[PDB]
Every structure is written in C-alpha cells, then in structure tokens.
Paper text:
Listeriosis is one of the most serious foodborne diseases caused by the intracellular bacterium Listeria monocytogenes. Its two major virulence factors, broad-range phospholipase C (LmPC-PLC) and the pore-forming toxin listeriolysin O (LLO), enable the bacterium to spread in the host by destroying cell membranes. Two phospholipases C (PLCs), phosphatidyl inositol specific (LmPI-PLC or PlcA) and broad-range (LmPC-PLC or PlcB), facilitate vacuolar escape of Lm by cooperating with LLO in vacuolar membrane disruption. Homologs of LmPC-PLC, which belong to the family of Zn2+-dependent phospholipases, have so far only been found in the genera Bacillus and Clostridium. LmPC-PLC exhibits broad substrate specificity, with the highest activities towards glycerophospholipids with phosphocholine, phosphoserine, and phosphoethanolamine head groups, but less towards phosphoglycerol or phosphoinositol head groups, and also hydrolyses sphingomyelin (SM).
Of all the constructs, LmPC-PLCC143S+C168S had the highest solubility and successfully produced crystals. Therefore, to determine the crystal structure of LmPC-PLCC143S+C168S (referred to as the crystal structure of LmPC-PLC in the rest of the text), we used X-rays with a wavelength of 1.26 Å near the absorption edge of Zn, based on previous studies suggesting that three Zn ions are in the active site of LmPC-PLC26 and the Bc and Cp homologs. LmPC-PLC crystallized in space group P212121 with two molecules, molA and molB, in the asymmetric unit, whose structures were determined at 2 Å resolution. Three metal ions were found bound to the active site in molA, and only two in molB. Interestingly, while the strength of the anomalous signal at the metal ion position 3 was comparable between the anomalous difference maps of 1.26 Å and 1.33 Å data, the anomalous signal at metal ion position 2 was significantly weaker in the anomalous difference map of the data collected at 1.33 Å, suggesting that the metal ion position 2 may contain Fe ions in some molecules and Zn ions in others. The absence of a pronounced electron density in the anomalous difference map in molB at metal position 1 and the shorter distance between H69 and H118 than in molA indicated that no Zn or other metal ion was present at this position in molB. A glycerol molecule was bound in the active site of both molecules, originating from either the bacterial growth medium or the cell lysis buffer. Interestingly, the N-terminal residue W1 is well defined by electron density in both LmPC-PLC structures, while there was no traceable density for the following residues S2 to T9 connecting W1 to the αA-helix. LmPC-PLC molB, with its partially occluded active site by the D55-S64 loop and the absence of Zn1, could represent the closed, inactive state, and molA with a more open active site due to the flexibility of the D55-S64 loop and Zn ion in place, could represent the open, active state.
Numbering used by the authors:
A (entry chain B): 1, 10 to 238
B (entry chain A): 1, 10 to 56, 62 to 76, 81 to 238
Amino acid sequence: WDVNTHYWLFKQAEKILAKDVNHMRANLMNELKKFDKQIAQGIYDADHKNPYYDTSTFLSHFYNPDRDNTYLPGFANAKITGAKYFNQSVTDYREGKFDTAFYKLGLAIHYYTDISQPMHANNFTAISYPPGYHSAYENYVDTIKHNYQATEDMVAKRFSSDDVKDWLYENAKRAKADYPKIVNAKTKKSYLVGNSEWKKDTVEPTGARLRDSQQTLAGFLEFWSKKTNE
Amino acid sequence: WDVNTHYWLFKQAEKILAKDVNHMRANLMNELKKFDKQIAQGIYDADHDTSTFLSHFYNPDRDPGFANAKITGAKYFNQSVTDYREGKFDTAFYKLGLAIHYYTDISQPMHANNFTAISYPPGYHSAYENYVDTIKHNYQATEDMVAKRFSSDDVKDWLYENAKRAKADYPKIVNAKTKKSYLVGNSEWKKDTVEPTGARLRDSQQTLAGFLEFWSKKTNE
Ligand SMILES: [Fe+3]
Ligand SMILES: [Fe+3]
Ligand SMILES: [Fe+3]
Ligand SMILES: [Fe+3]
Ligand SMILES: [Zn+2]
C-alpha cells in the first residue's frame, strides 16, 4: 500500500475496536493512544526507509503464500520479518520495555498490512509487467482510501491460531484471492494505453480489500494484546 | 464528575503542562507540586443547602439570587489571584482548588444542562458519574495533547466556553436510548456512553491545563 495508507489502516482498525468496546479492548485502546507516536514511527520507518536499502529489504515486503515456502538465508520475506517484529514486541512488552515494544508493533503492523495488498501477495513488483503499475496503483489507492473508512457493520476478524506466522499467511491468502481484480488483461491494457479505466475497474475491489484489511488488522491488534496478556 | 474524577482531571492537566514545560511555565509546575495538598483539599471541599447545590450547575444558554457554577467558579478564581498577589499562598492555592472544581464540573454535560440527581430518570446522573470514575483511567493524558486556551481576559468567558463544549455533548450522554437502557436495567448505556465520555474527559483535561496556565499568567502579570 507522502502516501499514508498504512497508518490510515491502523487508524481505521482503532475505530473498529473503539466502536464495540469491551474490557480487554479498553485497555488495549488506552495503550495504542498513549504510544501512538512510537507505533506511527515504526509504521513510517518500515514504510519509507526499509524498502529502499537493498533487494533483501525490498523482498521483505512481499510474501506469496503459495510459493515462499523455505527461507533462503539472507532473503527474509514479509511473513518471516513480520513475525520477527511481532514476537519481539510481545517479549519486550512483557519485560516492560514499552517504548521499544510499541515501536516494533508499528513495524509488525507495516508488514502485516503490506501483504494485505494483492500485488504483495503475488510477487508483483514495480518492475513486473507493466512496469510502473504497482506504484501507480498504490498512489491511486492513497487518493481514494478516504471513501472506505471503517463502518458500523465491521468487526475485528480473527484467524484460528496462536502463532502470528499463520495470521500473516491467512492475511496474504485473502489478498492473493483478490489479485485477479487488480491485475488482469483489462487493467494492464488500460494502464498501458494511458486511460483511467483501470482506476474505475479497481476502485470498488480496492475498497473491499481495504475494508477487509482494516478488519483483519483490528483482529491482529487484539491478538497482539492477547499475546502480551498470556 | 470516593469518586475522584475531579482531582484526576487536575493530575492529567498537570501532566499536559509538565510535558511541554519551558522556563516560563517552570515556576507554576513547582507551585502545583508544593501546594498539591491545598489544591486537592480545595477540590475535595467544593464537592461536599440549595445555594451550594445550584452552584454546581451552569446552563450557558440560560439567564434566582443564587449563584451558578460560572459565578461561583469565577468568584474563587478571581479571589485566588488576589490572594496570590498579596502573598497568601496557602489560601491562594486552596481557592484555586475550589475554582478547579467548579470549572471541571461544567465540563460534565449534565452539569451544563440542568440535569441533576432528581432529573428524570432519577439516579441516572449519579450512575453515570460513578461509571465515569471506574473507566477514566483508560483516558489518561497522552503526548499529543496540548493546553487549550480561550480568547478572553475574563475567567467568566472561560467558564462559559467550557460549559458550551460540554453541553454540545449532552445528547451523547442523555437521550432516548440511554434513558431507556438505564430504566430497563441493562448496561447498554455504559457501552453507548464510553467513547463520548472518553472524548469529553480528554477535552476537559486540555481545557483545564489552559485554565491553569491562564491562572498563572494572571498571578504573575
Ligand atoms: Fe505498502
Ligand atoms: Fe507496494
Ligand atoms: Fe462533579
Ligand atoms: Fe454531578
Ligand atoms: Zn460540584
């Protein structure tokens, strides 16, 4: 996903938690508010710094759940990297290192939301054909995400596992399922010809993907809270 | 708002002032620390006839020989400033505590709209304030907060503006849904009011920090 889609997803997920408050969510919400700056910096650092250091860090933003099986040394994908920061943040929190914990939570949020973008779940990079469509699409999403803010009917979506690796896998699987709505013969030809049909063709599937990502991120934050409270 | 929401608001406002402290604010922070007990007792004493009861309410949209919270809050604030300037610091900070009590009271929407313990449904007022007491700790001061100021040299206008902000939130606290919830005896009103309560508490902390900074400027001018 000055693009701010990742932080925006975090804010929408916070709204989903707040609108249906319960005991544990109230404690989590107070923490997320108090440590917003630390979380925001983690999101930003993964967003605007990490992808551009080399190809190892660039690859860390992608995870194809139907391919990226074995870990080749020095080539961590988004599932491995996201799980690393998530698990370290839980450990730091439980040791009382809150500032670091919430920063690393921000890092984990970036990787988890990155693979909710279908291109990131199917090895479609900025140099995949047609070159430039990846960045054009993400810039476009930034301009229209405000039409798909959290709504009253939404819920936190959870996955059935105590292991965050599986949350990352399942979030990417859902995104990959939407890849044909974003990258297809029609949108690729539209982007090459230079008309805006790809924008009209992808806006509603983008809105559904963003609204799903908000909900799975709300569940992910609740899961983070559960792990810290174990 | 042993319910301690009023003192809690003062402690949150103190945190807001402390995090953005500079040399011009530094003396006030030490004063608040040195006179915490006097301020706390001023807040506590205001909490406990008809003159004293009416004095905790101020509907800013309405016009008795009896003082409302704007008049009583301004009385103690202005006296506190005078006492400070005459060197009567123990008394100055005690009356500051009284003034803090009246100012934070009308940051509570019911107090800004004549909704008392006997207003219908009777008992909802105290049920709400007791509930707020139990959940305020989820809305403590955060680093994004600031002291909020109003454009006036007259504390009466600060009291008016604080009450107007509270009154705008009254429909979020007292409405057909919450009143029916409280009457039927389920807890739905708690779920419906928690987020507006959190927003009200966060605004009140910030306007109180501005109020303390404003008081300090008056004492040092
Ligand atoms: Fe991204
Ligand atoms: Fe991308
Ligand atoms: Fe009160
Ligand atoms: Fe009251
Ligand atoms: Zn009172």
